[PDB]
Design a protein around this ligand. Structure first.
Ligand SMILES: C[C@@H]1O[C@@H](NC(=O)c2ccccc2)[C@@H](O)[C@H](O)[C@@H]1O
Ligand SMILES: C[C@@H]1O[C@@H](NC(=O)c2ccccc2)[C@@H](O)[C@H](O)[C@@H]1O
Ligand SMILES: C[C@@H]1O[C@@H](NC(=O)c2ccccc2)[C@@H](O)[C@H](O)[C@@H]1O
Ligand SMILES: C[C@@H]1O[C@@H](NC(=O)c2ccccc2)[C@@H](O)[C@H](O)[C@@H]1O
Ligand SMILES: [Ca+2]
Ligand SMILES: [Ca+2]
Ligand SMILES: [Ca+2]
Ligand SMILES: [Ca+2]
Ligand SMILES: [Ca+2]
Ligand SMILES: [Ca+2]
Ligand SMILES: [Ca+2]
Ligand SMILES: [Ca+2]
Lengths: 114, 114, 114, 114
């Protein structure tokens, strides 16, 4: 099944934050309006926050997360959770290696903001 | 129901990150084994990270999040999600006011690391 | 926080199923736009499916689950999860007692159908 | 990423319930101890329950859901959710066709029971 693609409410501000847990340099691209809107890169085995940004989901609401290591796409796993019918998280893990920890790049999207 | 309490695997490193979306200064306490191990304080209405730390779950694995504003405990909402039977998130929202957006402090716990 | 209240897409068919895990007879009420649409009841310590029904979310999309035992309201816990940006579950547990297993009545709402 | 595989606590009873939403007759296999422990079969486009059973997760705790239609394996999507640090759901959707509704067989695993 397709992973790393989320339909947000249209025209909504959201937070996106990426963490790294791998020997390899992680590249995270976040797409809105089907165009890259934020990019984060870095190597950490200590859960570094390789970047955090506020973005706008735009007229379609479509947000896509892509992860690669030196151009090689990582395998993604994702889901969305809603708490008290109001607070939304879109969650992504990614695997760059063989161990299947799926924490090599972790991405968390949250909305609403403010 | 009790919210903001999670049983992690024992003696495991985990990441904890807090975001703020409120006029009020948020104070996040992270307890391991019923003692405060990390505290984050900050103010933002734009999802700013007010703290990030790597902790160890210790012999019990018991991790608790508490949030206060101006010494008043916030109401919490929480859940844990596991992706591909490997990647764990414990998610907390909190409400310091009347709008029930539950984003006033948002806390993301993730494991494993490395 | 409020629990057991879900906003579904409007005018959508959804499934609702209830399971029992208690010495007490559970009564599960499912409200659509604040009116009882389904009522299930039974007594099992072995996960009996005490009712299952297909309902329509109608114009508001508001679905609420309430549980009573001993004519006393049970305490609820809930969340919504979305898989592959398409498959939705609204999950409810309830506690009628003191052991806080929150499985005394379990309710699962799923959509889309067909 | 692997889907439909869950690590439960060892030697623990769990419920498994399967629903159908497809023209195709669904075959749901639940493996424990890497051996088939239960098989459900049926057809519905109205979310009918095609099977419900209580199984034991065994010494490993490894539970695996597989779905097939006329001997062709369906593509799975899954996740686990924990509410109030006590109530666990393992959720599976499956796709046997081209519309990617992932509801053709839906499987809900819940524990603990009793
Ligand atoms: C330190 C190590 O770094 C990566 N592993 C590798 O890059 C790797 C690639 C190929 C073969 C073996 C290891 C990660 O996938 C792994 O989870 C771990 O964080
Ligand atoms: C900016 C504003 O800040 C807080 N609101 C208050 O401090 C507040 C003040 C007065 C009355 C009610 C609430 C938050 O709870 C609210 O979600 C919003 O983020
Ligand atoms: C079998 C038992 O049934 C209820 N418990 C009681 O009825 C109860 C009886 C006596 C004292 C306290 C509670 C449940 O809350 C409990 O989770 C368990 O399923
Ligand atoms: C009624 C219909 O039944 C199946 N569809 C098919 O059997 C199908 C498979 C391949 C091509 C066309 C149809 C399902 O995948 C679909 O979601 C819908 O529930
Ligand atoms: Ca890895
Ligand atoms: Ca890793
Ligand atoms: Ca608020
Ligand atoms: Ca707020
Ligand atoms: Ca109970
Ligand atoms: Ca019980
Ligand atoms: Ca289908
Ligand atoms: Ca279908």
């Amino acid at each position: 099944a397709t992973q790393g693609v989320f339909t947000l409410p249209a025209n909504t501000r959201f937070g996106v934050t990426a963490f790294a847990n791998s020997s390899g340099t992680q590249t995270v691209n976040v797409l809105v309006n089907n165009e890259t809107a934020a990019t984060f890169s870095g190597q950490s085995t200590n859960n570094a926050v390789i970047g955090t940004q506020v973005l706008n989901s735009g007229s379609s609401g479509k947000v896509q997360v892509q992860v690669s290591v030196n151009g090689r796409p990582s395998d993604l796993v994702s889901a969305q959770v809603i708490l008290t019918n109001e607070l939304n998280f879109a969650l992504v893990g990614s695997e760059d290696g063989t161990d299947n920890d799926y924490n090599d790049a972790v991405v968390v999207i949250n909305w609403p903001l403010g």
